[PDB]
């Protein structure tokens, strides 16, 4: 009877997820370790309540992994999660929501992994797109949000060694606090890559709009986290906003949760398989006598590499999904987001030959 407690935390999600009450210890998809899954649906959605709720839970019950989803647009959630994964040397998966928005810096000791694309993959795709439509002259505009440095580099890198005639005209760096205007006015290019948070973005646009740089002639392309919840669209978001997004259509929540439990339950089974051990439950986020810093690294070798049934879920070093299915989307005229492209693996399939006008 090899068990492993898993917490499924669902902050703000509509309760459409139903987990087997674990009476009959029937095994999960024929894996050696039975996951004892504890469901939890927090109502309050502020980070404070989450840190409290997750932590309390970890001392009360015997948890050796956390699958965590939220329907909020708070990248904040990611900090609290990386922190906990670190303090407790426990794997925590950022399955969806703010909890999975690119966290650039990340405690290299933590086991916080996020679903969806890395800052790099996303950059590599935004260029992948600009080619399909021979959009070669462009400016970058980032804020100070962690990642900006890593993002700009990925662009500059792929540019340098490319036969294609890329012209990176400007790169801005916005000290938010409206001195932005004097900066954003200096923009010439037609294509603009804007790297920042959703909330930062809405200010940045409100400004550009009353400077014209947002309209016809200018198309803005933007990372997955600025789209955020596609159901919430700022007034200031320009129609004709291109964005990369994780795929919330063919990939429902319950499928991720399944995948979450799978990732962990596999790693655990493959460790019990190679060493008669599964790391005891750590029971404090704070009071840390759990200097068990070694059995961690071992687990971490198995989590990082799961492939389950059809899907491949192996993770990158910086804790992003290595092979995510992406969707390019477009802020239309009626102000919804349309699907207008897919990305499989280095394979960018678009829907239109003539790029639409909104
Ligand atoms: C959630 O439900 C409880 C139960 O009565 C309520 O008192 C609380 O304020 C609610 N919070 C939100 C954001 O709806
Ligand atoms: C993950 O990496 C290891 C290390 O050699 C490899 O042997 C393993 O089979 C990989 N995952 C899969 C599904 O092959
Ligand atoms: Cl929110
Ligand atoms: Cl993201
Ligand atoms: Cl950075
Ligand atoms: Cl299942
Ligand atoms: Cl499509
Ligand atoms: Na993500
Ligand atoms: Zn199955
Ligand atoms: Zn092409
Ligand atoms: Zn979703
Ligand atoms: Zn051993
Ligand atoms: Zn791939």
UniProtKB/Swiss-Prot annotation:
Comment on protein domains: The extracellular N-terminal domain (ATD/NTD) endows NMDARs with a unique capacity for allosteric modulation, harboring several binding sites for small molecule ligands that act as subunit-specific allosteric modulators of ion channel activity.
Protein name per the record: Glutamate receptor ionotropic, NMDA 2B
Oligomer and partners: Heterotetramer. Forms heterotetrameric channels composed of two GluN1/zeta subunits (GRIN1), and two identical GluN2/epsilon subunits (GRIN2A, GRIN2B, GRIN2C or GRIN2D) or GluN3 subunits (GRIN3A or GRIN3B) (in vitro). Can also form heterotetrameric channels that contain at least two GluN1 subunits and at least two different GluN2 subunits (or a combination of one GluN2 and one GluN3 subunits) (in vitro). In vivo, the subunit composition may depend on the expression levels of the different subunits. Found in a complex with GRIN1, GRIN3A and PPP2CB. Found in a complex with GRIN1 and GRIN3B.
Extracellular domain ranges by topology: 1-358
Modification after translation: Phosphorylated on tyrosine residues.
Record-annotated disulphide pairs: 55-285
Family label: Belongs to the glutamate-gated ion channel (TC 1.A.10.1) family. NR2B/GRIN2B subfamily.
Function: Component of N-methyl-D-aspartate (NMDA) receptors (NMDARs) that function as heterotetrameric, ligand-gated cation channels with high calcium permeability and voltage-dependent block by Mg(2+). Participates in synaptic plasticity for learning and memory formation by contributing to the long-term depression (LTD) of hippocampus membrane currents. Channel activation requires binding of the neurotransmitter L-glutamate to the GluN2 subunit, glycine or D-serine binding to the GluN1 subunit, plus membrane depolarization to eliminate channel inhibition by Mg(2+).
Organism: Rattus norvegicus
Binding, Zn(2+): 96, 248
Glycosylation site list: 43, 305, 312
Upper taxonomic lineage: Eukaryota, Metazoa, Chordata, Craniata, Vertebrata
Distribution of this protein across tissues and organs: Expressed in the hippocampus including the dentate gyrus (at protein level). Detected in adult olfactory bulb, brain cortex, hippocampus, striatum, thalamus, superior colliculus, with much lower levels in inferior colliculus, midbrain and cerebellum.
Entry's localization field: Cell membrane; Postsynaptic cell membrane; Late endosome; Lysosome
Residue span relative to the full protein: 32 to 394 of 1482
